Write a protein that binds this DNA or RNA. Structure first.
Ligand SMILES: Nc1nc2c(ncn2[C@H]2C[C@H](O)[C@@H](COP(=O)(O)OP(=O)(O)OP(=O)(O)O)O2)c(=O)[nH]1
Ligand SMILES: [Ca+2]
Ligand SMILES: [Ca+2]
Ligand SMILES: [Ca+2]
Ligand SMILES: [Ca+2]
Length: 341
DNA sequence: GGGGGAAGGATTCCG
DNA sequence: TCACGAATCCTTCCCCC
């Protein structure tokens, strides 16, 4: 089986460059302004120019401005990036029936039946890159391998504006050389757990008793890592369906005052329903981010769909539950709808 | 003993 | 300040035969 993974380069910022080309060549920072003060918030992403100086996704906007005071700072316009993405996804859909859109700027294509060997795979990769650049003026990076995980790793190694193939022979090498922390799904928490067990590479997962691994990182993560280490991981490319829709907003100031919090909560509900469109959820969860940036939530699943009036009513009750069961002040408040009919 | 579900949270980083 | 949306999985609790 041959998998071709496509990941768009510094996506949000590149889209802003496409819409305003005079931005090209200069540091561009797309920001998420939270409203607590002047430039409160964090960076969603920055172009490679800005990243050379340490400005990238996740850092505080104020910290980015200390480093690059003259960069161009733009507010994130997700709806715009989403429409551009969809167009790109429709182009890729032209190169394969088996396609998995993994996110706003990532997709996996099973090109096994329309290509022989990695030579043709590579060539199809170039045609894809070129097609997207000519049609949308968007550069992307392509990764190709025997399964989804190595196709993604391949792209990560080839970024930006690249293309790379990880053949059956390199897979074997990577299993031995690749820091296990570099494997998708292995975050900081899991990587530390694995280090303690003496697992530094995928290979290491083969000489440890499974029950021991499972006990430390969970059955699912253990079976996942072992399958990869055995060169046996082979998850099919399939359509992904959205399972939940929600919105969470930052309040000007922290609070525990119901009447002060409600307006934010209600705006979150209105936007969430607009997003749901025709989907009707049976579950609602109120999510709160506390002053110490901890996350707490309380939800309820109904035996039927939730009307907006029901959502307003139930949300207030769930919020009251949070306030009653957690003494901390609330900093961010929101809702999430799931279990669609 | 174990088959669901549901609730709240841990992790991930797919953003 | 993780200074800002969504999926999978895990633990615990609960109902039931
Ligand atoms: N709000 C927010 N958005 C993010 C964050 N990380 C990524 N995004 C958004 C903007 C990114 O352009 C988009 C795609 O994420 P990617 O991880 O693929 O990074 P990008 O595409 O920005 O850079 P890349 O060339 O792939 O290294 O998702 C984040 O931490 N917060
Ligand atoms: Ca990307
Ligand atoms: Ca991506
Ligand atoms: Ca990692
Ligand atoms: Ca990322």
């Amino acid at each position: 089986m041959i998998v071709l993974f496509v990941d768009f380069d510094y996506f949000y910022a590149q889209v802003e460059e496409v819409l305003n080309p005079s931005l090209k060549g200069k540091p561009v920072v797309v920001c998420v302004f939270s409203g607590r003060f002047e430039d409160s918030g964090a960076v969603a992403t920055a172009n490679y120019e800005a990243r050379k100086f340490g400005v990238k996704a996740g850092i505080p906007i104020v910290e980015a401005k200390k480093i690059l005071p003259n960069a161009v700072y733009l507010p994130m316009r997700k709806e715009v990036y989403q429409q551009v993405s969809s167009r790109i996804m429709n182009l890729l859909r032209e190169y394969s029936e088996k396609i998995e859109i993994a996110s706003i700027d990532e997709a996996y294509l099973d090109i096994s039946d329309k290509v022989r060997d990695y030579r043709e795979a590579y060539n199809l990769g170039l045609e894809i890159k070129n097609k997207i650049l000519e049609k949308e003026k968007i550069t992307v990076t392509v990764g190709i391998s025997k399964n989804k995980v190595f196709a993604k790793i391949a792209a990560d190694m080839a970024k930006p504006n690249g293309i790379k193939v990880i053949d059956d022979e390199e897979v074997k090498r990577l299993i031995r050389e690749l820091d296990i922390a570099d494997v998708p799904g292995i975050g900081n928490i899991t990587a530390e757990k694995l280090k303690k067990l003496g697992i530094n590479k995928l290979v290491d997962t083969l000489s440890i008793e499974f029950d021991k691994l499972k006990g430390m990182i969970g059955e699912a993560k253990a079976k996942y890592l072992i399958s990869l280490a055995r060169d046996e991981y082979n998850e099919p490319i399939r359509t992904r369906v959205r399972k939940s829709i929600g919105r969470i907003v930052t309040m000007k100031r922290n609070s525990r005052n119901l009447e002060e919090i409600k307006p934010y909560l209600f705006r979150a509900i209105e936007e969430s329903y607009y997003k749901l469109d025709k989907r009707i959820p049976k579950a609602i969860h109120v999510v709160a981010v506390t002053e110490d940036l901890d996350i707490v939530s309380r939800g309820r699943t109904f035996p039927h769909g939730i009307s907006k009036e029901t959502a307003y009513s139930e949300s207030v009750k769930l919020l009251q539950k949070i306030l009653e069961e957690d003494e901390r002040k609330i900093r961010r408040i929101g809702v999430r709808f799931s279990k669609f009919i």
